Amino acid sequence: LRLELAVDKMVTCIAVGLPLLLISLAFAQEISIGTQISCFSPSSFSWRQAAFVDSYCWAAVQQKSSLQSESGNLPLWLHKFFPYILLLFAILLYLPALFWRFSAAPHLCSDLKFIMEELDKVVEQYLKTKKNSSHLIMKYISCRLVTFVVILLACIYLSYYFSLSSLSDEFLCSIKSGVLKNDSTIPDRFQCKLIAVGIFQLLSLINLIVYALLIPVVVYTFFIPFRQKGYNDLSLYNLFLEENISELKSYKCLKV
Amino acid sequence: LRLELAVDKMVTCIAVGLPLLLISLAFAQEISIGTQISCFSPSSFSWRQAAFVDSYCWAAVQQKSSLQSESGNLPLWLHKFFPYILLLFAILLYLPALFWRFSAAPHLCSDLKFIMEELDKVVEQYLKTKKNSSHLIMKYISCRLVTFVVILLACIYLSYYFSLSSLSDEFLCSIKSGVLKNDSTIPDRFQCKLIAVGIFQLLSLINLIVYALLIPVVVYTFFIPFRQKGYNDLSLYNLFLEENISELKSYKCLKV
Amino acid sequence: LRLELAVDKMVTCIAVGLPLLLISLAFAQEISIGTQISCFSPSSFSWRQAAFVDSYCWAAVQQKSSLQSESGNLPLWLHKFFPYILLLFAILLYLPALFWRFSAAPHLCSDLKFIMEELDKVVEQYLKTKKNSSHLIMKYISCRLVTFVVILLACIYLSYYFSLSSLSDEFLCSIKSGVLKNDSTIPDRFQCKLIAVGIFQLLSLINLIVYALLIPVVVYTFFIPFRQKGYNDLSLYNLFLEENISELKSYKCLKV
Amino acid sequence: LRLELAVDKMVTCIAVGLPLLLISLAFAQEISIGTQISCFSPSSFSWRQAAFVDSYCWAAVQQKSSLQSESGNLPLWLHKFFPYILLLFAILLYLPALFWRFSAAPHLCSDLKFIMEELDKVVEQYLKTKKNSSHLIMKYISCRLVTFVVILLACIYLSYYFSLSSLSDEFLCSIKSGVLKNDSTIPDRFQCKLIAVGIFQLLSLINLIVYALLIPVVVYTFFIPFRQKGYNDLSLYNLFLEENISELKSYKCLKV
Amino acid sequence: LRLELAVDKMVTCIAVGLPLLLISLAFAQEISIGTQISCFSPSSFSWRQAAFVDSYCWAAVQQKSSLQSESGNLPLWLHKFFPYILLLFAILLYLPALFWRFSAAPHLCSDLKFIMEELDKVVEQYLKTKKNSSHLIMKYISCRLVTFVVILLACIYLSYYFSLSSLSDEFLCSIKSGVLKNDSTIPDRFQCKLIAVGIFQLLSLINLIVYALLIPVVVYTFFIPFRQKGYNDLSLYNLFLEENISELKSYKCLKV
Amino acid sequence: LRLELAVDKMVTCIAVGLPLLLISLAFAQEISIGTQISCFSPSSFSWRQAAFVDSYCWAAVQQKSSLQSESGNLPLWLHKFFPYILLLFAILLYLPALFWRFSAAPHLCSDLKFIMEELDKVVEQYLKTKKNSSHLIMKYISCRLVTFVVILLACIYLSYYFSLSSLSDEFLCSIKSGVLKNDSTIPDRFQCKLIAVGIFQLLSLINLIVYALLIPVVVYTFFIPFRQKGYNDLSLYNLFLEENISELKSYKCLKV
Amino acid sequence: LRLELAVDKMVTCIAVGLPLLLISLAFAQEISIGTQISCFSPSSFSWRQAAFVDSYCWAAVQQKSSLQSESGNLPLWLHKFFPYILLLFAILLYLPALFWRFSAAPHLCSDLKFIMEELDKVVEQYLKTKKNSSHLIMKYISCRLVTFVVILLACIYLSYYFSLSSLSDEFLCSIKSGVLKNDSTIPDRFQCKLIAVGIFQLLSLINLIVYALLIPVVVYTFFIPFRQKGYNDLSLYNLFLEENISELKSYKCLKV
């Protein structure tokens, strides 16, 4: 028996898998390249001093006092945490489906089975009572609206992230804080690079295109009365029946 | 049968999975970056001497004698054991559900089956006797209260951890202890960084927001008498039936 | 029952498996060699300075300001993202089959079961009504056309990628931007190599040959009336029956 | 049909999983940090010589002749083998459950099934004969006592281990034994650190707290006659029935 | 039911698994050594410069401009792509069996079930009609011929590959291309070695011997009229029956 | 049915798992420490020369000519192959149980089922004929004796291994063989360490204690007539019936 | 049913698993030590130059021109390919059992089921006809003979491999070929070691002992007439019946 429509499950699967697939590709590239940041330290620096510079600048991306970037410090904030936000979007998009299957799936399952059993025998009072009620349709529309809002916010974020200048992956960092402040052997600023930024912007473009094409599909899902071929549980039950009526032989015989 | 309510199941699933998911991402970042601490040692130091400095300062965070930090030794202590506390919270939140499914699921399942079978035939004395009793409701409320207290403590900890100044990941360490005390070639103090601190604070913020949103949900779960749409087993049985009444065709027939 | 034709399933499996197999082999080479780019930096450069040059040139293949390549910066752009586009093609070729299985396969399954159960007894009006409809055939042809267009675009891309000159993996890069601009110790240009390009072009040739062989197969699939042995659901139902009639003993009895 | 009480299963699961979970966390931290010991060696030493010093001091932890430590040789010995003892405790606590599930489990299962099948036909002589016997109760109490003794020994060990001074992770070692004795280029003593000591002590504290909480639970399990709501098989069969009586509909009818 | 003969399945399994097994051994050896090429570079070269030389010469095996080899650049091309050709052979040998299973196996299964059931009378026209047809024998012979041709081409390739002189793994390479052309500090030619070549030639000898032994087996499969103990579809049915007739009790009784 | 006794299953499980568990711990430590042998070579040696010294000394533990050890070359030989002997014991202890399961389990199962089916109806002649026979008892005693002998040999070995002096992990090696013999820049002897020896001795002590405790259990299993509550199949059948009689309700009814 | 005798399946499992287990141990040791070959190169050699020497010598074992070994160049060839030959033996020993299960198991199963069903009712003519035939006994003896010959060849190879002198792991190599021939800075010969030779010889000894013990077992299997308790299918069927007769209660009833 089906408790989720084909278009809804397609949308959920795309919106959840795509961010995770892109995260997997980004992680593979990260392990392949070996570093998400690289700083140019002097040749007098030993290997561990250069590694300290790299790690300090990586940790200093989130600190105001030791950075200088032409695009501002917000772009450098986002480059470091890009995969985290993608997984956050994936979880937030997967949750509404989880809540629907936990809460409303069983009640709709029972109602559909009861309707299909009263059908195949001919229940009008049951259908009219559902027409009066607006319980399940409210849950369905609320879940779809949460999904739509999450997708819209993801589109806004990915459009902003892709908007960041390609040279936003460069920044100047200073390690001369604390005891190192008066170290005359350390240069004042180090030129750093965020290596993965180039991958992240193309991944954001891909996800943005997919979500922009997916938004109209989600919008079409709200017009539940129009999909049926007012806003009441009767309308949603009708849609589920038509998507499910293929399993009722009597329906096919009547169609003939 | 549904021996656990949808709200309880979703709350437990979120409260347990989220810390584990954040720990997984933190571990992925830890392996990607490669170091949880980087110390700036002289250029004259060999690579093994610099590695010794790093490992000594990593283990010296818990030692008050050989450190100097403006935020105190306590915040530096927390930075080192952040993921472990997350796993501790995950275990402490998963345990109450485990105890419920071990010590209360069978007895509730048997009672529900008996009530459902005595129904579908029409038991009043059984329901009144349950109204007198207060056994299962006490277990349910105790488990919910344990979960609520654990979540409140997690919120307090994560609000404290996120409150630590971003510059609390820096500290001065000394290795000149023991035979190294008279070594004039070793600097008195080394500048250290806790690299993962920046990401740990964002993870703490995410978990804090999620748990702060979950607290009102858990609080609403306590009012078992008001969730029906006194504090006795009759109320819990009524809630479980209404959540599970969908599995009886006679109920739907009567509703029609 | 079979809701997907043998040739269609073969084509989908080949088209969605070959790019993934090539991606797996490319990943194997990437891990084996350990570097996707190698730059020749002075001997005075420390190890970490040379690593910075390598990673900076890796991140600067997507930036015009820091490149000088005889074949243009577009071919160098493609060399970096070749494995991603293979997975893009794999997903775009797997999606139509999944959408067919989700939104068209069960209805055809029910229709075939009804037809076979009505047969084995002799329904003519049902078949004529299907002849008077173009619902499922439109979905089938749309999915086949989407697959054909995706395969044609993949062929065009792979033919272009394979056309890139073998020496297109070489390019000159400069790290002297920003603070490093006035550094007289850094050479103006570094000679870089894209090592995986040699593997990628042979993989592209293999995929191009396979997809060019598949194009005629996909084209033959469009002529649904010819495979039957007009453009309406009757032809598709007839084809599916003849492919699946083997599971009807009465058909064999009539054959003999 | 539950052949193990809920309290016993909970106790066994906690006592076995917790040491394994702590071992997993310790192993992850050991991999992430990369060194269980770091020794400070002269800068004249090549890297292989410093690695030899580290390995020799790691192997010399168990050799009194070549080490000097103010806390004694025993605490340094324990730091090296902490996870091994944790797994030893885990195995020793899992074994009694294994022995109970192999022997005395099928016998109790058969006896319970016979008693329940004789019930629903209302056996008194059978219950009285079991009252005379003291066979299965002896095995149950022996297993519980073994578990209690193992938990008490684990508590004693963990309380001792946590009691070790934090500075017990430092010790002086000499590699000048054998052909290296007269090597004037090697310093007499090297300062060593055990990096995982600080984490191991927190893990020991966690396990100690959990096991100290479990001890009263285990002690409560011995009073089998008082858990009813003399020491004979009847007193154990009664408890197992009350735990498993939920699967007897006639019992619920009689209760009503 | 056996839809594919024992000899056919044996041949397919050997011809597919053996190349994959050899690929697994080759990959294990490659990871064991870590380098598929090693070039001797001056001691003045830094380690990163020598790594660049190694990678450049690895990528320069496919380029005529920067290579000198007495055996020609063709043998050097093959050494780099030996496992790829093995996997190509494995896929090309697995495909015909896949197509047989997808497009011919079910029809033969249905025919066998029909004829088997009729033979259990306790049908002559069906057998004669099959004798007057070649629909399935043509498919079987086409698949066998494709497999035979693929195996013959694999034998030719492996015999050629093994024929390459053992010294063919050596070649001279020049990195002085582009800005490096006028670098007087770089030697004109670097001697290179393909380390895996020694493994690859023995793996090729093993595979060549196995496929040379399999060729007569495959050739024997074409004489379908002779295996039964003319070229028409009846003969294939006879062979499949004799293979599968062991499941008919009536056949054994008649044999007695 | 239980074709193997609880005591025998426990003994086999312990004897097989314990060596494998200790091997797993040893392997984990080996990978964590990163080296099984450390040798002190001059500082003039480059890193690769010191690595050659380490590997040559590792390979020369089995060669008498190039080593001088205080405890003899035999103890140094054992240190290198300790885990392999543990796995050898594991295999040799798992084999007898496998041979029993493959050569006595089916006949025993059939005999037990026949006896149980003839019982539950009341066969005396069958039991007397079994009394007049020693077929299965010989197999059982032979398997138990093989297990006992293997355990005794393992105890002897582990007691010998644990008896090796702690300083047996040190030895002197010379690489000056062949062309290196006349090299005056190489020290005549190098000081080596077998690092894992200290852990291997504790693992041997653990296994020795476990097997010493297990020997009396195995010896008790030989007295098959005494466990029954002469050396012929009757006693063995009686033992397996008494262990298995719990699955016979008629037995319990008669016992009452 | 049991289509494979216990002794035969024991022999196959041992002969196939033991080489695989030894190969697994060898691979674990190879990864732990990290090198299969180590050459002593001058201290003036860079790291990459010494690595080139090691790789060239590894690839030069299969080349007569550039080596000098007093034990012959054949033994050095074998040391490099020991695990490959072990896997070859494993495959060649697993193949006969697989072919038997492919081309003998179904017919034998059908014949055994027919014989058992005709029995349990009393077929004499069937057994007498089998008395003359030799179809299946020939297959059985051929498979056993192939297994015996493979085991004998494995014993010969392992006895030869173990006979190689322990010092056969040392050899001199020259890298001065081609361009390097006139390099006066490279020594004429490098002393090399094959580190895994010492372990490989013990593994060969273990496998040799096991296979030498297995040869008499395999020889005993040929005498099919004597295993009964002439050379025709009647004897083989009788043996399989006596091994399989335990699954026929009528046989036990007659035995009583």
Residue numbers in the entry:
A (entry chain F), B (entry chain G), C (entry chain E), D (entry chain A), E (entry chain D), F (entry chain B), ...: 28 to 149, 195 to 301, 323 to 349
Authors' text:
The cryo-EM structure of mouse PANX1 was solved (3.1 Å), representing the first published structure of a membrane protein extracted by Salipro nanoparticles directly from cells. Cryo-EM micrographs revealed that frozen-hydrated complexes were monodisperse with 2D class averages displaying secondary and tertiary structures, as well as heptameric organization of mPANX1. Extracellular and transmembrane regions of the Salipro-mPANX1 are well-resolved in the structure with clear side-chain density visible. In contrast, much of the intracellular regions were not well resolved in the cryo-EM map prohibiting complete atomic modelling. The dimensions of the Salipro-mPANX1 heptamer are 90 by 104 Å, which is slightly smaller than those of hPANX1, which are 96 by 109 Å. On the protomer level, the mouse and human PANX1 structures are highly similar, with a root-mean-square deviation (RMSD) of 1.556 across 256 aligned atom pairs. On the other hand, the N-terminus of Salipro-mPANX1 could not be resolved, similar to what has been reported for several other PANX1 structures. Furthermore, the structured intracellular region of Salipro-mPANX1 exhibits some minor but clear differences compared to the hPANX1 with several alpha-helices shifted; for example, helices encompassing residues 342–349 (Salipro-mPANX1) and 342–355 (hPANX1) reach a maximum displacement of ~ 5 Å. In addition, it was not possible to resolve any lipid-like density in the Salipro-mPANX1 structure. Since our structure contains endogenous lipids from mPANX1-expressing cells, this lack of lipid-like density could suggest that endogenous lipids have a certain flexibility surrounding mPANX1.
In this work, we present a case study using a streamlined version of the DirectMX protocol working directly from crude cell pellets to purify the ATP release channel pannexin1 (PANX1), and investigate its structural and ligand-binding properties. PANX1 is a potential therapeutic target and associated with various pathologies, including inflammation, pain, ischemia, and epilepsy. Several PANX1 structures have previously been solved and all of them approximately show similar overall structures albeit with differences in the intracellular domains15–22 and lipid-like densities at the membrane interface.
